From a paper:
Loss-of-function mutations in human [name] are the direct cause of the lysosomal storage disorder mucolipidosis type IV, a neurodegenerative disease characterized by abnormal neurodevelopment, retinal degeneration, and iron-deficiency anemia. We also determined the structures of the mouse [name] channel in the apo closed, PI(3,5)P2-bound closed, PI(3,5)P2/Tem-bound open, and mucolipin synthetic agonist 1 (ML-[name])–bound open states.
The synthetic agonist ML-[name] can by itself stabilize the [name] channel in an open conformation and the structure of the channel in complex with ML-[name] was determined at low resolution (∼3.5 Å) in a previous study. ML-[name], however, is a highly potent agonist and is sufficient to bind and stabilize the channel in the open conformation by itself. In the ML-[name]–bound [name], because of the tight packing and coupling among various parts of the channel, the local conformational change at the ML-[name] site also propagates to other parts, including the PI(3,5)P2 site and the luminal linker domain despite the absence of PI(3,5)P2. As a result, the ML-[name]–bound open [name] structure is almost identical to that of the Tem/PI(3,5)P2-bound open channel. The Tem-binding site overlaps with that of the small-molecule agonist ML-[name], and they appear to exert the same driving force on S5 and likely yield similar local conformational changes. Similar pore-opening mechanics was also observed in ML-[name]–activated [name] and TRPML3 structures.
Numbering used by the authors:
A (entry chain A), B (entry chain B), C (entry chain C), D (entry chain D): 40 to 198, 216 to 291, 296 to 527
Write the structure that this text describes.
Amino acid sequence: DLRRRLKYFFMSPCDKFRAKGRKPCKLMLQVVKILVVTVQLILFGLSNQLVVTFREENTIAFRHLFLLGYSDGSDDTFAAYTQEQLYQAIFYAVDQYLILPEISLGRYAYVRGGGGPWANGSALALCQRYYHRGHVDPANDTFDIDPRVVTDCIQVDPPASYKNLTLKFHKLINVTIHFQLKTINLQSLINNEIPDCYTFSILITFDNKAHSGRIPIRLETKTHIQECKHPSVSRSFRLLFDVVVILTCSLSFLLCARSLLRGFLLQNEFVVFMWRRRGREISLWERLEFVNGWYILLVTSDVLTISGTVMKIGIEAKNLASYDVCSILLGTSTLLVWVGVIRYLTFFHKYNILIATLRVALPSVMRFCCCVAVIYLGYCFCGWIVLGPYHVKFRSLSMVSECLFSLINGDDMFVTFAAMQAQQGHSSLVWLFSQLYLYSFISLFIYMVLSLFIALITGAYDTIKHP
Amino acid sequence: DLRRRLKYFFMSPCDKFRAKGRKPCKLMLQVVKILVVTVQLILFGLSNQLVVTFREENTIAFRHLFLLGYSDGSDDTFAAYTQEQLYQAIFYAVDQYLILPEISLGRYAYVRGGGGPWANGSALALCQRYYHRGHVDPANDTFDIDPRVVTDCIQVDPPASYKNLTLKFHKLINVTIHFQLKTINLQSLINNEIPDCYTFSILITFDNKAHSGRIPIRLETKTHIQECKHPSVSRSFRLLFDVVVILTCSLSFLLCARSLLRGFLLQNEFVVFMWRRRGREISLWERLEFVNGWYILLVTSDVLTISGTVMKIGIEAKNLASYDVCSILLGTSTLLVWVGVIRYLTFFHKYNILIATLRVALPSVMRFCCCVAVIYLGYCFCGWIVLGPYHVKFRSLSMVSECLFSLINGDDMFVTFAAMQAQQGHSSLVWLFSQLYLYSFISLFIYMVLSLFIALITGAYDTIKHP
Amino acid sequence: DLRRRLKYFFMSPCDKFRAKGRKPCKLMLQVVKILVVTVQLILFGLSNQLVVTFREENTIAFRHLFLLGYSDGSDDTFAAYTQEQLYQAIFYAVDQYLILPEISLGRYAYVRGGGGPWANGSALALCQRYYHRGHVDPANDTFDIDPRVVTDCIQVDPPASYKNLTLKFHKLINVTIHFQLKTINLQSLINNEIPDCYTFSILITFDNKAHSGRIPIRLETKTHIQECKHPSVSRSFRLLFDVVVILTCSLSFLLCARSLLRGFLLQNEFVVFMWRRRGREISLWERLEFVNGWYILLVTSDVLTISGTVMKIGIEAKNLASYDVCSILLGTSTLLVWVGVIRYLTFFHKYNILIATLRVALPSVMRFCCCVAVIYLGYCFCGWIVLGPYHVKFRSLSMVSECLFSLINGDDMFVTFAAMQAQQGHSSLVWLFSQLYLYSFISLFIYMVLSLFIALITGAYDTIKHP
Amino acid sequence: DLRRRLKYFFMSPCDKFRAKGRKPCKLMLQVVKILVVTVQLILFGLSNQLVVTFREENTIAFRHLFLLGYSDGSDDTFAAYTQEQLYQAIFYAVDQYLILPEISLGRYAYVRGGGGPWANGSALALCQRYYHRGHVDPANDTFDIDPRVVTDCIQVDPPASYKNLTLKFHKLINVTIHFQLKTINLQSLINNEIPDCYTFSILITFDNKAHSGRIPIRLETKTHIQECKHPSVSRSFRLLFDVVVILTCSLSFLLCARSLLRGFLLQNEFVVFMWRRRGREISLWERLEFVNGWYILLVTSDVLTISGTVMKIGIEAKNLASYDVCSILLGTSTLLVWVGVIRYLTFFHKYNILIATLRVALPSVMRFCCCVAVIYLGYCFCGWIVLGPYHVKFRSLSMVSECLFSLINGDDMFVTFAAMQAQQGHSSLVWLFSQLYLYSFISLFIYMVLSLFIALITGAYDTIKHP
Ligand SMILES: *[C@@H]1O[C@H](CO)[C@@H](O[C@@H]2O[C@H](CO)[C@@H](O)[C@H](O)[C@H]2NC(C)=O)[C@H](O)[C@H]1NC(C)=O
Ligand SMILES: *[C@@H]1O[C@H](CO)[C@@H](O[C@@H]2O[C@H](CO)[C@@H](O)[C@H](O)[C@H]2NC(C)=O)[C@H](O)[C@H]1NC(C)=O
Ligand SMILES: C[C@H]1CC(C)(C)N(C(=O)CN2C(=O)c3ccccc3C2=O)c2ccccc21
Ligand SMILES: C[C@H]1CC(C)(C)N(C(=O)CN2C(=O)c3ccccc3C2=O)c2ccccc21
Ligand SMILES: C[C@H]1CC(C)(C)N(C(=O)CN2C(=O)c3ccccc3C2=O)c2ccccc21
Ligand SMILES: C[C@H]1CC(C)(C)N(C(=O)CN2C(=O)c3ccccc3C2=O)c2ccccc21
Ligand code: NA
Ligand code: NA
């Protein structure tokens, strides 16, 4: 019961081969797997980029075609301030829709019945929504509101009545123009793909929910991709390459599972042996240590890779169009595959500084982060509610977190101060509070929190560095 | 006189319970208090954001309605350079005021007698201010000025004479157009609130105080919020939740006060005992140490929370409209409540690195800051007066401080240099001085001051870290 | 010969008083001197800001009055691309000059004979400069140039011939329009000052020196300030306060000189004594050490303060108008006065960390900087010549230095890369070189140079810190 | 066999002279070489800047002359959205070309036969490219495409038919307008150079490859520089100075080669001696160490300098016009020459901190970088494919690398987050992935990777610092 096997288990592939004539199959697979997974990622990215561009470019074209006086870059300030301006914008949108085929550079088809729920079979719906009862009378400081929402729709069919529109401004909530357009993404031919049919759902909103004398106007689109009914192109190895990637990932999965099982059985044998030699129920954290975390990482990376590859095959077969989910799966798998090659550098301590440090430092780092997180969250909520109405970088919780995290790393500091300087928070009290808030957060987190964090990490390194 | 009580006083809640069967009431209150205070903060923020948006959006609408040729973003460069331009801008403002009801998207009411002190009961006042005597004659290098200010006002009433305005350009100081508009913030219905009446005081200024051939034009508003006289909405737990928050905070206050008193009495007993056993008047800094700073922090946090909650109740009852003060109170209380939970991590030294370091390092840090502050203030004053006229980031003292503080953290460096590069300070001497100023400040504070500060903090950490 | 005097010389003011009943006159002067110098700086800054604003605002007004189609912010791209555009711009400038009094918001006077050297007594000179001989014939790839510059001027007098202007485009070098305007800076009355007469020399340049089909157009001004011949204002302590500042600075100067002399005499006595007791010519660096550098700093600060104060008196007396030099003197003196108060913190080692560190670290820091400076200068020259034509941040040597210095501190990195990304240097070779240049400079200086610099500074601190 | 020669070999120039009366010729050459190489670099930069400006300014002029409604700064958003807009832009370009001589401020000559391959001897070619067969019918979800590209060109000759252009929009790929213009860079006379003939190849592209309803329009130029056939200027030491630089560099090369040979021979002699005294084949890494890396650096720097100087002579002689390659050679040589002077500071250890540290730290640094590079590359590929379609900073691989490298140094953090905030990736899944990606990358690389890197560098410094 010398158990030299337990010695051969924790052996570098070079030592595993000098000792037992064992070809490093897993090491060779990783390099080939890295190459094939990265190549597959790039190949998918070609068509993914084509799709995203098509959607974005069409949206910009719609904004230039339907939004009166639209100019690039003014998406957040585009608004109407006069009754005449609002009427002109609405009528311009409808008129441009009605003459689209004669003007548009793209080849768009109308969608009969695409006007939405309010379009009773019409292509375009022009809905205005107002309170059921509204009697705003600021002169007498009096109002009488029935906040029930009434929807009034005008049906527009491509080849008028919509010109007779009268807007109830004093109680208007919003006006919307819903219509759908069909077009074919021909550019996919460059990738030797068959073009799909894209249906864009276009929603133009004139938003008066604030009743503030300023009515923002925006255009939004939703895209639906589907195979064309009758495609004909007079014109690859992509499917074969995806099958190859699946083969490599399946082989690596099999090898990793076999190694994990062998390690678990060795753990059981060792544990029962130590129970014989010394006392029983003696090993605990060690039973855990008998596992290889890198083999778990590889197993989960190749599972993600197989899922992404199957999804890529489905998208190319036109069974599904979820390019975002597939791109995310393939990119995460590529990153994990690149990371996995560090497993073979963990044997030589000269190249293993990063991982050894991480292993030593993570418990203290997590204990530190526990304390630092409550302070961070308190600051986040405080800033979000107090400064969010006044500060453009504190509008939402995620935005506040991004702002504070970038401030911790010394980024965009003066711009953060200047945002409050420019408007003074329309209240010296808010400005003074922002001064105290920003100075205290920056000083605390840059000089104490970050200094202590770094000190913990470098202390862990000093612990693993032999000197 | 073993005084195991003095042992039970400085005990962790887990130890306080394993020893005396004591339920950690304060620990449980903190979590519940955290939750309820944060929820209340968010709930208040809903309506606070509604109010701030209403004010800002109305101001933008006014700028588009009354400022001739106004475009978004040009607030600091909007100005007139010709007599005709100034006349056209003034007359455009008045004309737009006179036809407001027919054009405005918002529902505004005039305010008869709102023209201000210069409007003798008129709705709009159009005042021009000029020197009592002014005989500027640059051709003969001669002038004769009586700098007494004369105000001449034209009364405008909504349904002319103001068209006959003649401006004394050579001695004009400024022209102002004061009027008031009433509107109802209907959007508050989404929060199940009763809309208020907002009165906006609008002041348009054509400023010629510089006599420089360029007359900046700006629009400012003041807002006054009050309950409507006759509201009617055909349509919550907010008051009940505020009462709940008050209950939790009052209970925590009571517990903290009771604990503080118990600790003070224990301090007195211990001190008199040590006076018996050893010499008299022996304890000093220790008598102080017998206090818990966290219980003081909790007491002041719940006082702030109660004040903010009462103010929130008042605002919802429409007894007052001070959303900024209430928001500041609630946000500060939320931050303090989140911070207070670290009290229970100060018992375990593994999680107490930050606080222990702070405690060890603050005296040396403050002694260092004493010296660093005089240098910083000297630089601040120097930059403010020498570079403020030429540099857009040195305009005011607070702006100079923000600039220098962000420079210490390496932020917006090149933009700071480039501001002086672009104009060269219209004097090579000023440019050279700015070069020396910026290089010396940046080098000194980034490489010496900050290095020494960090070294002090990490030295304190090394002192409390057991290794 | 116990020389307790040499003990009393190196004594803190508190010790100097507990020992010899000596009131700390210098310590009290520093605080009062700080206060009065800062107040004087601010008071001067009021009028300095007024002057600078006047100049800048007038320049902007001129650009809007004389530059056809000018709009704020387009100062670097404002240019003509067509013969008609150039003619229209020139004629617009002249026409606006000719009707200035009827349109300008400022009160400007013409200057008869102000047209410059080319104006033979005329108010406006419109000069075009072209080669004496120019026969550019790109069709035959032939030219014949006599690069002698010929100046042709048209005289314009305010109440035509200039309308008959014909420009020799193929050989045109530039066109210039020179004229002068007089105006009175009335706003100075707010500071209770007598307004001065400002003469602006306006130069409009249509620059064709590049012969590139694009003719940049710019407006420049020079300002000359002088007292008005016949001022009359129907309407301070500033002179008295300046005399007070001079008094305080002179007293401090006297005390510092007396102390420096006493220290030098004590040095001589000690040195000769040590020559008696021990060998002769034994002391060297110590003779130097017997001097107080802070007393030298104070002496030079109060000299600067007196010079600045006398200059301020001169400017207020209207004997001179050099606000930039005076502002620089007063600001430097204010900074030095604030710094000087650290002298009294150098006695207590707890507050003297910064200065003691600096003293220990400066030799090693300077030896390090010697080596780092040659690398920095090599990079500066390389970047300036190779990348300056393509990169907007490398245009000039000072700009290159600012760019590299800010890069060392991690500032504006991505913008620096993106500048080269956007144009690709119109040559992949230049882009690749810029990649190597930026990556190598950033990596070297951030990770090695700065790390070593900080290590030297903190090592010096470790040397002076008692632990 | 005392071999004091081996002692005299590793001797500082001061010691080499105190011992053997040896004038430090190489040390003196370095200073003179530094001066002359830097001066030559600046002198070349004069003309290099002239050339680059000429090209850029002409390109901007062309964009203003030929692109309808072009305005500065809108290069990436300039596009057509309507059939009428596209026709107007095309016809405007052609019309402006046809009347160029009467309008252009520059003196341009037509190039007969310069229209390109599609111009059969014509000056201007106006080509439209469309699919051989295209039957896009989105209404029936059907298409029939023959993706063969058909080119149809219209020949335009300067002093119509091109007005009869009909564009097949449904199958249009792109339209291009190719023409050439000749002009003379007269500004070179300021450098006392003979102006060259520049031929600009202008390509205007209306790109419809995306078929997205938006057709970007761009103008590109290629420049060809050649000597004029018949130049005549009625009008330096540059060639003499270049010969001087060549002389200095050749002398330094000779001295460095002689020293390298002497060192190699000394290595051989020492090695064979040690083989006699002690065992044979004993020295290995030492034989390598017997070489001076600085002499290799100097040799390669002066080789680069000579190549650049010869190229500069060629360009001035008009035998070649490759200013970019010459500028790169001269700038790299200047940087290397400045760096080379550190060789004489490597003798004194007080000034040799940087180099000694680098020498000690490079092996550990490289081992660390090996591990860090796979993680970095994985992140780069992941970001490039997943976020590149949505994020403007992830468009290309080089751009992704610049973004991640600047993020490591804490640069442009909040802007990176905000880019994804603004559009939300049009998919909450993409936004969430970007959040995880950015947070994980920033945290890992700033807090662990960079901390460990710095710790390695400062540890190497601690190893070479005597304390
Ligand atoms: C226009 O206003 C109506 C009514 O205010 C909005 O309709 C609501 O939409 C939300 C989310 O789509 C639903 O949860 C509600 O049930 C709808 N009705 C009400 C009474 O709230 C509509 O969303 C607005 N349109 C746009 C484009 O914003
Ligand atoms: C227009 O100019 C007048 C006179 O210069 C300003 O009136 C002064 O305003 C300040 C602050 O409001 C008061 O302290 C003064 O008493 C007022 N009179 C004088 C003679 O100074 C007025 O503020 C200016 N208007 C605007 C909108 O700036
Ligand atoms: C960002 C990382 C590093 C460290 C220590 C600087 N740190 C904080 O400073 C506080 N803190 C958060 O709570 C947090 C939560 C989500 C995003 C970013 C942060 C964030 O910056 C922290 C705290 C908890 C978890 C991770 C971290
Ligand atoms: C900002 C904090 C950290 C530290 C040490 C970097 N530090 C300085 O560098 C000098 N300094 C001021 O005087 C100061 C005053 C107000 C705002 C910011 C500052 C500021 O940056 C300082 C000095 C005094 C009090 C606090 C601090
Ligand atoms: C800026 C300071 C700090 C330090 C060490 C970072 N450092 C360099 O990195 C190289 N370096 C110059 O040569 C230099 C010269 C002029 C302005 C800025 C610099 C500059 O950044 C340097 C070198 C010489 C003198 C001062 C310094
Ligand atoms: C930039 C230098 C310093 C250091 C250690 C921070 N480091 C990384 O963090 C990872 N890393 C790359 O892989 C890399 C490759 C190309 C450009 C920039 C980088 C880059 O930032 C790295 C890694 C390999 C080679 C050089 C370096
Ligand atoms: Na930055
Ligand atoms: Na930074």
